[PDB]
């Protein structure tokens, strides 16, 4: 059933596609939680997304926490064991392609410039 014609502060998702570089250990320097069986996300999203992102690698920029995960390297993340999220990471030689989305509400801004000293 459908009550009507609703829709009101909705929110824009912007995807994004950074290219990590392998480091030395940390590798990727990040790291997911969850699953489509543990669903750690208190309220309950079967999306993998990353709890950690490596301040001093190659993430900490790239990529933010909270990075509802929705493709790697051309494999969905979406309703995936977390062993299967990971794997496409021990899998890519070096460099991995991620492709999250983040909330982006429907806001607006006025037009701003530089400033004086």
């Given at each position: 059933g459908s009550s009507?014609?609703?829709?009101?502060?909705?929110?824009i998702w912007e995807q994004y596609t950074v290219t990590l570089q392998k480091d030395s250990k940390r590798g990727f320097?990040?790291?997911?939680?969850?699953?489509?069986?543990?669903?750690?996300?208190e309220n309950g999203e079967t999306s993998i997304?990353?709890?950690?992102?490596?301040?001093?690698?190659?993430?900490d920029g790239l990529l933010q926490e909270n990075d509802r995960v929705v493709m790697?390297?051309?494999?969905?993340?979406?309703d995936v064991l977390h062993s299967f999220a990971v794997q496409q990471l021990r899998k890519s030689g070096k460099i991995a392609a991620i492709?999250?989305?983040?909330?982006?509400?429907?806001?607006?801004a006025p037009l701003s410039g530089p400033s004086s000293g």
């Open positions: 009507g014609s609703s829709g009101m502060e909705e929110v320097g990040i790291a997911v939680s969850g699953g489509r069986d543990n669903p750690h996300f997304v990353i709890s950690d992102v490596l301040p001093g690698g190659p993430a790697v390297n051309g494999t969905p993340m979406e492709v999250v989305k983040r909330p982006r509400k429907v806001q607006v």
